[PDB]
Amino acid sequence: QEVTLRLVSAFPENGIYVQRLLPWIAKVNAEGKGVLQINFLGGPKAIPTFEAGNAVKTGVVDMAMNTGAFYTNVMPEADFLKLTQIPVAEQRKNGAFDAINKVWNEKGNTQYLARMVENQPFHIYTNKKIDKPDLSGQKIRISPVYRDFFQALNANVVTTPPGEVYTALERGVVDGYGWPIGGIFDLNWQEKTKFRVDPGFYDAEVSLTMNLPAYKKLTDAQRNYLQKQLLVLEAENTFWTRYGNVETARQETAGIQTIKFDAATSKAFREKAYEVGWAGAMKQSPEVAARFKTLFSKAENLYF
Ligand SMILES: O=C(O)C(=O)c1ccccc1
């Protein structure tokens, strides 16, 4: 009557996401004896980064900490969560969360459990200075998050998992990379980064997901306990605020220079990101993308 769920991380273990994950797992275990436990199996060494989505779908493992950008091979819609412009607490209340889960269930045999990273905008990082919002001539590491936007900026893109980024930079295979504001020091990337472009765009999605049959097999007691603890994890998303501010300062102190544009240019830059971001989602999955777009913003925010 105690269930043990096996969880893998699609992100490197020395990263902030795993560092946030591990204490939460420890709490789940300490407070769930006789009910529910989580066995953390480790990171990309356990199941490759881009295959963790498939492992969850087919029940090779029960759970993952992952971003939908890493499992577009399960469903193209997986990458759409970068486009949320309300936090997950508000998603649970306005229909966005439910809609995400229903798509995850139907298209990926996966239950969408919780979002444990938000308020972490993405940025371009590079070693080649720019004064315009154009990446012409630059070779930029990406995942699906940045593909549509970086190509619109005329970048030559190359896909790698997070674990390969340092190597690509050291060997000069790329001039830069996409990543959130936070976390570039974890794998020592600051050593090979000279600039961050502002402003940020989209919002990093890192979430817990679960094999759907496994989820349905939980008893009410186990599910309710899991749910209680998932809400605890999300409640700590206020952390991402300080983290973004601190990481921003850390970059300045380590000699990384911020590239800035004027108000009009910055505004257009972000609008372009979302404009091409949504166009891409609409091309891949028109019905779902339209449903999400409606629920991913609040009216009173639209103008601002
Ligand atoms: O740059 C990435 O690998 C990426 O897709 C991502 C997504 C969420 C958080 C951090 C990175």
Side-chain angles (χ1 to χ4, degrees):
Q1 203 180 60
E2 180 193 87
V3 66
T4 292
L5 302 177
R6 276 176 266 194
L7 189 152
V8 71
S9 177
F11 289 87
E13 286 173 44
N14 289 2
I16 183 65
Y17 306 151
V18 168
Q19 301 309 304
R20 305 272 297 164
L21 180 66
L22 291 183
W24 177 79
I25 293 182
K27 170 180 192 64
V28 172
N29 290 339
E31 304 177 357
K33 294 299 176 183
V35 179
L36 182 148
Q37 303 279 283
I38 295 170
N39 176 4
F40 180 60
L41 296 175
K45 287 200 297 216
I47 264 149
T49 293
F50 289 117
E51 288 301 323
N54 269 322
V56 168
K57 163 181 171 181
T58 63
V60 170
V61 303
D62 296 302
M63 300 174 73
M65 183 190 66
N66 201 356
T67 176
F70 298 169
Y71 52 95
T72 62
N73 58 354
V74 172
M75 48 198 178
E77 296 90 347
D79 183 53
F80 294 5
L81 313 188
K82 71 190 178 186
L83 301 169
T84 50
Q85 295 191 81
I86 54 168
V88 68
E90 289 174 40
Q91 301 169 32
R92 288 181 184 274
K93 294 189 312 199
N94 83 329
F97 192 98
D98 195 81
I100 287 165
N101 184 66
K102 182 173 162 41
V103 167
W104 262 232
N105 282 184
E106 290 173 358
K107 296 207 182 303
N109 198 38
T110 296
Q111 182 81 10
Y112 187 79
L113 291 178
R115 185 151 168 179
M116 60 177 282
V117 177
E118 60 184 4
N119 289 329
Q120 282 293 287
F122 294 96
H123 293 256
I124 300 168
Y125 292 92
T126 186
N127 292 318
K128 287 180 178 171
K129 197 179 221 170
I130 57 173
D131 48 16
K132 304 155 291 167
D134 191 70
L135 292 177
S136 285
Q138 297 215 22
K139 191 112 179 287
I140 304 300
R141 173 268 168 187
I142 67 160
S143 72
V145 169
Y146 328 94
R147 184 203 42 256
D148 294 317
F149 181 43
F150 285 10
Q151 281 172 346
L153 294 180
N154 299 310
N156 296 114
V157 299
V158 52
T159 299
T160 82
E164 284 179 10
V165 168
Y166 183 96
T167 291
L169 287 168
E170 207 273 327
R171 298 198 192 142
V173 169
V174 295
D175 298 307
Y177 55 91
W179 194 259
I181 182 62
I184 75 166
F185 294 83
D186 298 342
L187 306 184
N188 215 35
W189 301 343
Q190 81 288 348
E191 271 189 1
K192 314 295 183 179
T193 308
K194 282 147 182 159
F195 305 96
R196 189 189 70 257
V197 179
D198 285 355
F201 55 90
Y202 305 154
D203 200 33
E205 173 264 319
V206 182
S207 305
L208 300 180
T209 52
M210 182 162 181
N211 175 257
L212 178 58
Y215 182 76
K216 292 172 152 170
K217 196 172 143 192
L218 300 178
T219 64
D220 292 335
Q222 293 161 346
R223 189 174 296 105
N224 288 333
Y225 172 68
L226 175 61
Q227 178 74 2
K228 187 167 88 168
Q229 299 292 40
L230 292 170
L231 296 182
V232 168
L233 181 62
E234 289 189 353
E236 317 164 359
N237 283 345
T238 44
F239 167 81
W240 298 112
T241 290
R242 268 202 69 120
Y243 185 63
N245 295 331
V246 169
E247 291 283 292
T248 297
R250 256 181 113 189
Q251 294 185 12
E252 164 90 8
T253 299
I256 295 172
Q257 297 177 36
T258 299
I259 297 180
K260 293 279 174 202
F261 312 109
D262 62 16
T265 297
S266 302
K267 177 169 175 289
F269 172 88
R270 301 219 330 128
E271 282 186 2
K272 181 184 198 149
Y274 282 95
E275 185 167 5
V276 313
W278 277 115
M282 285 295 307
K283 280 294 163 171
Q284 296 299 309
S285 188
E287 198 180 317
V288 166
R291 183 185 307 134
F292 287 5
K293 180 177 188 171
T294 294
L295 303 167
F296 278 11
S297 287
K298 299 302 269 151
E300 65 266 17
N301 287 340
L302 291 172
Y303 182 87
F304 295 93

